[PDB]
Amino acid sequence: MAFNDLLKQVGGVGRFQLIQVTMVVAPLLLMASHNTLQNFTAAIPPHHCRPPANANLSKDGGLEAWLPLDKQGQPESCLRFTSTEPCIDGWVYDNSTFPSTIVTEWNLVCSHRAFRQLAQSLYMVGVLLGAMVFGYLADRLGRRKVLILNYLQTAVSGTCAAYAPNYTVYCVFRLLSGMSLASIAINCMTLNVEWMPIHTRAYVGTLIGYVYSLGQFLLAGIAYAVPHWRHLQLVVSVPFFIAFIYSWFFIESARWYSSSGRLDLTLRALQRVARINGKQEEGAKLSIEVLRTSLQSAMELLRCPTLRHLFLCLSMLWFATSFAYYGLVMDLQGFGVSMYLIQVIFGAVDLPAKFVCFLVINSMGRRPAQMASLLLAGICILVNGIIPKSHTIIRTSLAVLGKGCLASSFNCIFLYTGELYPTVIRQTGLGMGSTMARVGSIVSPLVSMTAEFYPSMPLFIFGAVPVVASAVTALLPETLGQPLPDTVQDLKSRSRG
Amino acid sequence: QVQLVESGGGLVQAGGSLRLSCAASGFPVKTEWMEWYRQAPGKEREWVAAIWSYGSGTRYADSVKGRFTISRDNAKNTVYLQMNSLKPEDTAVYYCLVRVGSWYHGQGTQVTVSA
Numbered sequence: 001m002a003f004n005d006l007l008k009q010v011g012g013v014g015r016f017q018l019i020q021v022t023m024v025v026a027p028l029l030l031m032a033s034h035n036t037l038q039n040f041t042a043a044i045p046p047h048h049c050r051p052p053a054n055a056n057l058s059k060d061g062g063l064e065a066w067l068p069l070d071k072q073g074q075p076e077s078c079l080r081f082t083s084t085e086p087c088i089d090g091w092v093y094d095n096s097t098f099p100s101t102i103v104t105e106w107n108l109v110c111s112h113r114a115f116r117q118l119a120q121s122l123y124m125v126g127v128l129l130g131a132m133v134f135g136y137l138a139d140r141l142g143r144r145k146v147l148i149l150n151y152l153q154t155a156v157s158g159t160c161a162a163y164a165p166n167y168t169v170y171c172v173f174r175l176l177s178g179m180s181l182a183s184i185a186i187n188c189m190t191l192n193v194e195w196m197p198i199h200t201r202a203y204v205g206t207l208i209g210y211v212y213s214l215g216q217f218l219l220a221g222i223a224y225a226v227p228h229w230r231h232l233q234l235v236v237s238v239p240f241f242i243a244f245i246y247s248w249f250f251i252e253s254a255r256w257y258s259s260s261g262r263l264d265l266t267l268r269a270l271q272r273v274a275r276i277n278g279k280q281e282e283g284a285k286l287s288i289e290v291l292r293t294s295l296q297s298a299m300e301l302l303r304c305p306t307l308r309h310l311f312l313c314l315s316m317l318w319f320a321t322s323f324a325y326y327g328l329v330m331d332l333q334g335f336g337v338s339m340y341l342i343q344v345i346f347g348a349v350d351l352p353a354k355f356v357c358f359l360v361i362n363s364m365g366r367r368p369a370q371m372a373s374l375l376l377a378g379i380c381i382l383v384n385g386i387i388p389k390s391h392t393i394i395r396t397s398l399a400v401l402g403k404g405c406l407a408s409s410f411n412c413i414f415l416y417t418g419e420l421y422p423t424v425i426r427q428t429g430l431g432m433g434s435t436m437a438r439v440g441s442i443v444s445p446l447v448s449m450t451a452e453f454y455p456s457m458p459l460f461i462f463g464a465v466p467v468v469a470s471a472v473t474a475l476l477p478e479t480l481g482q483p484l485p486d487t488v489q490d491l492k493s494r495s496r497g
Numbered sequence: 498q499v500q501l502v503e504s505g506g507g508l509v510q511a512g513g514s515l516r517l518s519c520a521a522s523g524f525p526v527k528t529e530w531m532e533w534y535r536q537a538p539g540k541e542r543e544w545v546a547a548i549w550s551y552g553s554g555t556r557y558a559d560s561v562k563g564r565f566t567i568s569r570d571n572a573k574n575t576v577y578l579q580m581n582s583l584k585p586e587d588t589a590v591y592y593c594l595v596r597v598g599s600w601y602h603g604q605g606t607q608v609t610v611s612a
Contacts, residue, residue, distance in 0.1 A: 071556060084598045
C-alpha cells in the first residue's frame with residue numbers, strides 16, 4: 001500500500017539495482033582518498049635555511065658554518081647564521097623521500113607554518129558549506145542533477161588545485177572540492193537508500209563502509225605509485241571526470257519524483273527499471289491511477305528542553321568523534337614507519353574493528369560499545385602523544401588501535417543517533433549531527449595549528465576532547481529494547497521508564 | 498644588553514688541562530642556549546659543545562664526545578668549558594653564543610697546543 005509494493009513489483013534483486021549501486025559507489029574510494037590526501041600531498045620534508053650566494057662554499061668546506069643545528073642533529077629549520085638572521089634567501093629541501101609537496105613549492109614553513117593547516121580548515125569549511133546548502137539545493141532540484149554537478153565540480157576543483165599558481169588559489173579550490181565532496185558523500189547514500197527496497201537498507205551502508213576502506217587502501221597504493229603532489233592530486237581527481245561523464249546514466253529516485261507532486265516521471269522510471277531488469281510483463285500493469293492510489297525543523301529542536309539536551313549531547317558526541325578521528329588520521333608524518341605502510345595498515349584495521357563493534361552491539365549493547373570505543377580512543381591518543389618520538393613500532397600500534405576505536409565509535413554513534421531520535425525529527429537530528437561532525441573536522445586542523453606553542457599539544461587536545469565528551473554523555477539512555485520512539489510525548493514517557 | 502666576555506686563553510702543552518670561562522650578565526645562565534663554536538686557523542665554524550636551559554640536556558659532536566665536558570655556575574652566572582686531552586689540531590678560537598638566535602658572537606679566546 002505504498003511505493004514499496006511497487007518496488008517489489010518492479011524488482012529488488014534485479015541486475016539494474018545491483019549494477020547502479022556498484023556503479024554509483026565506486027567514486028567513494030577517491031572520496032576517502034581526497035579527504036585524506038593532505039598527508040601525501042602536503043608532507044613536510046626536512047629543510048633548512050639556504051646560505052646566501054655571497055659566501056663561497058668552496059672555501060667553507062661544509063654547510064655547518066652557515067646553519068645552526070638543533071638538538072636532534074639536523075640543521076635549524078627556520079634560522080641562519082650571519083657569518084643570526086632568518087631565512088631571507090628561502091629554504092633548501094631534500095628529495096630522498098618526498099620529491100615535492102606544497103610546503104616545498106610555496107615554502108609553507110616557519111613564519112608560514114600555519115598555512116597548510118589553514119588550507120585544510122578551508123577545505124573542511126567547503127565540506128560544511130557544500131553539505132548545508134547543497135542538501136537544500138538537492139531537495140529543491142533533485143538527486144541525479146546534483147550528483148552529476150558534484151562529480152564535475154570535484155573533478156574540476158581537483159585538477160585546478162593540482163595546478164595552482166599560488167597558495168590562495170589552492171585554498172579556494174580546496175574549498176570548492178570540499179563543497180562538491182560533501183554533497184556527493186551525503187547524496188549518493190540517500191539516492192541508493194531511496195531506490196533500493198527495505199531488505200538491503202544498511203546493507204547498502206555496509207557496502208559503503210567496505211568501499212571507504214578499499215579507498216583507504218587505494219590512496220596508499222597511488223601514493224606509493226605516484227609521490228609527486230602535482231601528479232598525485234591529478235591521478236586521484238581524474239577518475240571523477242569520467243565519473244561526471246558516465247553519471248548521466250543514473251536514474252532518479254522514484255521517491256523524490258513522487259514527492260515532487262508528479263507521478264508520470266515515477267511511472268516512466270519504474271517502467272524503465274522493469275525494462276532493464278527484464279520483467280516488463282509485471283511492470284506493464286503499472287499505470288497512473290495505480291501510482292496515485294498506492295503512494296498516499298531546528299526550531300522545535302532548540303525549543304523543547306529535553307530535545308535541547310538530547311541535541312546538545314549528540315552534538316558534542318559528533319563533534320568529539322570527528323574531531324579526534326581527523327586529528328589522528330591527518331597526523332602520520334611523525335610516526336616512524338613509512339607513510340604508505342601505515343596508511344595501508346590503517347585501512348586494514350578499519351574492517352576488524354567494525355566487525356567487533358557490530359558483534360558487540362548485536363550481543364552486549366550500543367551505549368556501552370560507544371563508551372568503550374570513545375574512552376579507549378582518547379586514552380590511546382593521550383598515551384600516543386606522551387610517548388617520546390624515539391619509539392616507532394609501539395607508537396604505530398597505538399595509532400592503529402586508536403583509528404580502530406574511532407571507526408567503531410563512528411559506527412556506534414551513527415546507529416545510536418539513528419535509533420534514538422523520535423521519528424518526527426529523526427532525519428533533522430541525523431543531518432545536524434553530520435553537520436556537527438563536519439564542523440568538528442573544520443576545527444581539528446585549527447587545533448593542530450597550535451603545534452608552535454607545544455609540538456605534542458595537538459595530540460593532547462585531540463585526545464582530551466573525546467574523554468570529556470564521554471564523561472558528559474550521561475543523559476543518553478540505552479536503546480537495546482528497540483522501542484523506536486515516534487513523538488516527543490512518547491519520548492518523555494519512555495524516558496522515565 | 499648581554500655581555501659574554503671570555504678569558505682563559507694561553508699557551509698549554511698538548512694534552513694539558515684548562516678551564517676557560519664565559520662570563521655572562523643581564524640574564525640567568527639557566528634560561529638560554531650557552532653554545533660553543535671554534536675556528537681553527539684556515540678552517541670554518543665548527544660545533545663542539547652545547548647546553549640548554551636548566552641543564553637537563555646536553556649534546557656534543559663527533560670530535561667532542563667523551564673527551565671534553567661543559568659546566569655551568571648559576572651563582573656566578575658563568576659557563577665553563579674545561580679542556581683535557583688536547584691534540585695539535587685543536588688550536589682554535591672558541592666562540593660563546595647567547596642563543597641559537599643571538600647576534601652576540603663572542604670575542605673569542607685563543608688556545609694553543611704548541612708541542
